[PDB]
Amino acid sequence: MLKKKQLTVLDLHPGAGKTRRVLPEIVREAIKKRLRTVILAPTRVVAAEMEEALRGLPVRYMTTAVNVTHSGTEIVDLMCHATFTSRLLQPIRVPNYNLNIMDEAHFTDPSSIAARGYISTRVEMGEAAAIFMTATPPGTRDAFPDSNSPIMDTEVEVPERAWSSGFDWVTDHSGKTVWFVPSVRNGNEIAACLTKAGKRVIQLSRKTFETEFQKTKNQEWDFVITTDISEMGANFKADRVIDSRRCLKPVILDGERVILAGPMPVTHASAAQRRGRIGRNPNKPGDEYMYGGGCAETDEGHAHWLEARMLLDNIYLQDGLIASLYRPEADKVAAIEGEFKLRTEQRKTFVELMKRGDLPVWLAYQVASAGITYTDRRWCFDGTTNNTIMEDSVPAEVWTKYGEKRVLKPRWMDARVCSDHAALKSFKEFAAGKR
Numbered sequence: 260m261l262k263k264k265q266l267t268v269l270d271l272h273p274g275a276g277k278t279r280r281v282l283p284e285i286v287r288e289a290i291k292k293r294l295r296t297v298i299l300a301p302t303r304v305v306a307a308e309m310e311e312a313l314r315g316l317p318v319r320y321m322t323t324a325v326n327v328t329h330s331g332t333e334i335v336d337l338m339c340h341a342t343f344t345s346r347l348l349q350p351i352r353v354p355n356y357n358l359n360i361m362d363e364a365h366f367t368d369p370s371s372i373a374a375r376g377y378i379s380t381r382v383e384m385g386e387a388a389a390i391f392m393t394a395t396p397p398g399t400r401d402a403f404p405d406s407n408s409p410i411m412d413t414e415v416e417v418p419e420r421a422w423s424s425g426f427d428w429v430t431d432h433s434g435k436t437v438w439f440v441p442s443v444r445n446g447n448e449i450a451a452c453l454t455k456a457g458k459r460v461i462q463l464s465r466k467t468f469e470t471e472f473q474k475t476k477n478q479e480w481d482f483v484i485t486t487d488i489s490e491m492g493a494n495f496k497a498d499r500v501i502d503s504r505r506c507l508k509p510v511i512l513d514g515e516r517v518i519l520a521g522p523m524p525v526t527h528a529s530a531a532q533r534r535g536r537i538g539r540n541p542n543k544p545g546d547e548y549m550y551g552g553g554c555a556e557t558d559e560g561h562a563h564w565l566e567a568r569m570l571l572d573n574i575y576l577q578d579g580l581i582a583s584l585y586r587p588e589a590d591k592v593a594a595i596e597g598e599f600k601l602r603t604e605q606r607k608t609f610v611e612l613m614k615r616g617d618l619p620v621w622l623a624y625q626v627a628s629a630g631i632t633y634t635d636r637r638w639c640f641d642g643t644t645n646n647t648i649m650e651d652s653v654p655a656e657v658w659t660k661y662g663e664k665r666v667l668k669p670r671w672m673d674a675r676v677c678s679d680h681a682a683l684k685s686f687k688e689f690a691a692g693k694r
């Protein structure tokens with residue numbers, strides 16, 4: 260695997276030991292061969308788990324998620340996917356890693372897609388080796404891969420709203436269930452219905468995952484209600500998955516606004532990862548997977564793949580060359596390569612709007628490419644009337660940095676800035692100049 264020009268897809272089934280067995284073997288061989296190596300974790304939770312798998316191997320953990328005292332002589336670095344792409348974008352020296360290992364390499368966040376594009380292009384140039392670890396490589400068509408233990412698969416209607424009758428199978432179960440929902444708001448309603456029925460429910464989503472996942476270890480629970488973030492190596496001691504088989508799809512409309520379309524079917528890869536939360540223990544056959552819909556190719560035209568092109572167009576590779584998306588997922592976007600390349604000063608603004616601003620890539624790009632500076636928030640208020648953001652069915656309002664109460668009406672409307680209470684609270688703080 261470790262030879263230049265090699266990209267290996269390590270596509271062992273979910274729970275086959277890619278992280279806990281195979282990775283430490285790859286790392287030992289890399290150190291022996293004096294290959295400067297990066298290991299890419301999708302989350303801080305997985306970074307901390309990798310430290311346990313790799314303990315007493317000389318690895319530099321480029322994350323505050325791990326309390327380790329480094330020797331200073333390690334030639335293996337571990338960081339999050341997003342950290343890797345972040346550091347490529349910034350005026351930060353990133354070594355030209357001889358071996359590039361991505362764990363949970365199906366992750367469809369823009370920074371993960373961009374990282375795959377950058378790494379696979381370095382491999383194609385003959386500069387590096389790479390290993391992509393995932394049970395569900397791009398374009399996988401198999402929602403029902405092998406497992407450590409037999410799974411009971413059942414197609415069933417799954418509630419997506421509070422219910423009073425007709426779903427007794429949901430609450431009659433005495434074990435632990437992981438339930439994949441398409442959105443935070445959707446999960447909140449199902450969680451409230453379960454709580455009212457006497458169940459103990461933990462909710463996970465991208466903003467809370469890194470701190471709420473610990474509750475799955477520290478608290479007794481009956482249900483985890485999770486978005487798609489638990490497709491990325493989240494391990495539960497569960498005996499059932501309930502899968503809506505639904506997601507939201509960010510869609511760029513007329514190159515002018517982003518909507519959250521759907522809910523609509525998940526990809527086969529997503530369905531396989533959701534189901535793959537169970538069937539992991541060969542001593543516990545007959546974990547259940549209850550699924551409420553079919554799969555479809557909903558990654559086609561999904562905003563994350565366009566956003567990954569916006570990132571890759573702004574990463575230096577060699578002279579004016581631009582990294583390509585990883586070939587198996589390159590047709591999910593119709594973009595002109597280089598169309599999003601920014602001049603130095605607009606690139607810095609773009610980066611800051613994503614890092615400190617915490618804005619979606621697409622929205623950071625619209626602001627930066629308009630020649631607006633990071634602290635200039637006038638664009639949050641001068642949009643068209645149809646871009647008015649609502650809070651409890653009346654326009655959302657903030658006090659501007661000038662002390663003026665104004666309706667939130669951004670010039671570019673990205674539905675991800677207000678898809679739930681927490682998102683809108685963060686965007687209100689941004690519009691107010693508070694970060």
Ligand SMILES: COc1ccc(CC[C@@]2(C)NC(=O)NC2=O)cc1
Nearest residue numbers: 319320321322323324329338339342
């Ligand atoms: C042991 O070596 C290192 C440890 C930590 C870091 C940076 C960690 C960090 C969190 N903070 C931000 O500046 N970048 C990152 O994600 C770099 C090297």
Ligand SMILES: COc1ccc(CC[C@@]2(C)NC(=O)NC2=O)cc1
Nearest residue numbers: 617618619675676681682685686689
């Ligand atoms: C998949 O990429 C994304 C990147 C950023 C965001 C917005 C996060 C946030 C905190 N910042 C705020 O202004 N609204 C908010 O929830 C959503 C998705």
